[PDB]
Specification:
Elements: H1 8-11, E1 19-23, H2 36-40, E2 51-55, E3 58-62, H3 66-75, E4 78-79, E5 84-85, E6 88-89
Antiparallel strand pairs: 1-3, 1-6, 2-3, 4-5
Length: about 130
């Protein structure tokens, strides 16, 4: 995804905030909308400068400075739709995993069959 490359060597453990994401799920169908004009004049968001972009995944939050992002993350909880929403940073991590192939076998049996006959008999009766 989108992001910026910073000197991870300087503090990889710290994982400095650069961009935040506001998840949506229990918001409901109301999450599909987000009027920008109303959003600008809404719940916490006006407290600090923040780039708000509507997305089907939620609301993108980009801050001009790391400090603003950190203050918003640490003390910028928001309540939207009468629901407290936390600040989730956009970080990615590559994990190493392996999925060995597996095979399964099943027992099979012969269905059998009927051999042909070159002769046949029948009972003759008339009533």
């Amino acid at each position: 995804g989108p992001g910026s490359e910073a000197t991870e060597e300087i503090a990889a453990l710290d994982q400095p905030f650069e961009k935040c994401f506001i998840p949506t799920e229990a918001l409901g169908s109301d999450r599909e909308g987000l009027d920008r004009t109303q959003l600008e004049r809404q719940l916490p968001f006006r407290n600090y400068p923040i780039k708000l972009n509507v997305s089907k995944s939620g609301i993108f939050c980009q801050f001009p400075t790391v400090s603003d992002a950190k203050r918003f993350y640490e003390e910028g909880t928001v309540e939207i739709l009468n629901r407290s929403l936390p600040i989730k940073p956009v970080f990615e991590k590559r994990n190493e995993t392996v999925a060995p192939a597996e095979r399964k076998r099943r027992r099979s049996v012969s269905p059998g069959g009927v051999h042909p006959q070159t002769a046949a008999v029948s009972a003759l009766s008339r009533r």
